[PDB]
Structure 1
Protein backbone atom coordinates (compact mmCIF):
# COMPACT_ATOMS: atom_id res chain seq x y z
CA UNK A 1 0.00 0.00 0.00
CA UNK A 2 1.10 3.61 -0.61
CA UNK A 3 2.78 5.25 2.40
CA UNK A 4 1.47 8.82 1.85
CA UNK A 5 0.16 10.66 4.97
CA UNK A 6 3.33 12.80 5.32
CA UNK A 7 6.56 11.17 4.08
CA UNK A 8 9.53 10.40 6.33
CA UNK A 9 11.60 12.90 4.33
CA UNK A 10 9.05 15.70 4.77
CA UNK A 11 9.14 15.07 8.54
CA UNK A 12 12.95 15.46 8.50
CA UNK A 13 12.65 18.71 6.48
CA UNK A 14 10.13 20.23 8.91
CA UNK A 15 12.08 19.00 11.95
CA UNK A 16 15.38 20.49 10.76
CA UNK A 17 13.78 23.82 9.78
CA UNK A 18 11.68 23.92 12.98
CA UNK A 19 14.70 23.18 15.19
CA UNK A 20 16.56 26.15 13.67
CA UNK A 21 13.68 28.60 13.07
CA UNK A 22 10.84 27.43 15.36
CA UNK A 23 7.08 27.68 14.70
CA UNK A 24 7.90 29.85 11.67
CA UNK A 25 5.68 27.87 9.28
CA UNK A 26 5.51 31.11 7.28
CA UNK A 27 9.07 30.18 6.21
CA UNK A 28 8.88 26.34 6.15
CA UNK A 29 5.67 26.58 4.08
CA UNK A 30 7.72 28.43 1.40
CA UNK A 31 10.14 25.48 1.16
CA UNK A 32 7.11 23.16 0.81
CA UNK A 33 4.47 25.13 -1.19
CA UNK A 34 2.20 22.05 -1.29
CA UNK A 35 2.21 22.18 2.54
CA UNK A 36 0.34 25.27 3.79
CA UNK A 37 1.20 26.99 7.09
CA UNK A 38 -2.04 25.59 8.55
CA UNK A 39 -1.31 22.06 7.28
CA UNK A 40 2.23 21.94 8.75
CA UNK A 41 1.26 23.76 11.98
CA UNK A 42 -1.70 21.43 12.61
CA UNK A 43 0.19 18.25 11.62
CA UNK A 44 3.15 19.09 13.88
CA UNK A 45 1.08 20.18 16.91
CA UNK A 46 -0.88 16.89 16.80
CA UNK A 47 1.32 14.15 15.35
CA UNK A 48 4.90 15.36 15.94
CA UNK A 49 4.55 17.26 19.24
CA UNK A 50 8.35 17.18 19.69
CA UNK A 51 9.11 20.88 20.19
CA UNK A 52 12.84 20.28 20.72
Structure 2
Protein backbone atom coordinates (compact mmCIF):
# COMPACT_ATOMS: atom_id res chain seq x y z
CA UNK A 1 0.00 0.00 0.00
CA UNK A 2 1.35 3.43 -1.00
CA UNK A 3 -1.70 5.65 -1.66
CA UNK A 4 -0.44 8.61 0.42
CA UNK A 5 -2.56 11.18 -1.46
CA UNK A 6 -5.82 9.87 0.03
CA UNK A 7 -7.71 12.99 -1.07
CA UNK A 8 -11.47 13.30 -0.49
CA UNK A 9 -14.13 13.75 -3.20
CA UNK A 10 -17.35 15.68 -3.88
CA UNK A 11 -19.65 12.76 -2.98
CA UNK A 12 -17.91 12.08 0.37
CA UNK A 13 -17.82 15.80 1.31
CA UNK A 14 -21.52 16.29 0.50
CA UNK A 15 -22.62 13.11 2.32
CA UNK A 16 -20.49 14.09 5.33
CA UNK A 17 -22.19 17.49 5.62
CA UNK A 18 -25.73 16.20 4.96
CA UNK A 19 -25.12 13.47 7.56
CA UNK A 20 -23.35 15.56 10.20
CA UNK A 21 -26.16 18.10 10.58
CA UNK A 22 -28.81 15.34 10.71
CA UNK A 23 -27.03 13.07 13.22
CA UNK A 24 -25.65 16.16 15.00
CA UNK A 25 -22.12 14.96 15.81
CA UNK A 26 -22.45 11.16 16.19
CA UNK A 27 -19.42 10.51 13.98
CA UNK A 28 -19.85 6.79 14.72
CA UNK A 29 -23.33 6.80 13.12
CA UNK A 30 -22.19 9.21 10.38
CA UNK A 31 -19.28 6.92 9.40
CA UNK A 32 -21.90 4.12 9.21
CA UNK A 33 -22.73 5.74 5.85
CA UNK A 34 -19.01 6.10 5.01
CA UNK A 35 -17.20 3.03 6.47
CA UNK A 36 -14.19 3.89 4.26
CA UNK A 37 -13.90 7.15 6.27
CA UNK A 38 -12.49 6.77 9.81
CA UNK A 39 -13.50 9.24 12.57
CA UNK A 40 -9.97 10.72 12.74
CA UNK A 41 -9.93 11.59 9.02
CA UNK A 42 -13.59 12.67 9.11
CA UNK A 43 -13.02 15.16 11.91
CA UNK A 44 -9.66 16.20 10.54
CA UNK A 45 -11.49 16.84 7.26
CA UNK A 46 -14.41 18.52 9.06
CA UNK A 47 -11.88 20.77 10.85
CA UNK A 48 -9.50 21.50 7.93
CA UNK A 49 -11.59 21.45 4.73
CA UNK A 50 -15.09 22.52 5.79
CA UNK A 51 -13.65 25.36 7.93
CA UNK A 52 -12.73 27.35 4.80
CA UNK A 53 -14.64 30.34 6.26
CA UNK A 54 -18.08 30.41 4.63
- What TM-score do you get using the length of structure 2 for normalisation? 0.72
Q: Number of paired residues?
A: 52
What do the CA deviations read for 1:12-35 (whole angstroms, capped 9, x no partner)? 100100111122111111111110
Unaligned segments of structure 1, at least 5 residues: none
- What TM-score do you get using the length of structure 1 for normalisation? 0.75
Higher Cα Rg: structure 1 or 2? 2
Computed over aligned residues only, the root mean square deviation of the Cα atoms, in angstroms, reads 3.3
Q: Which has the higher contact order (CA 8 A, sep 6+)?
A: 1
Q: How many Å separate the matches in 2 of 1:51 and 1:21?
A: 22
Unaligned segments of structure 2, at least 5 residues: none
Q: How many Å separate the matches in 1 of 2:4 and 2:28?
A: 29
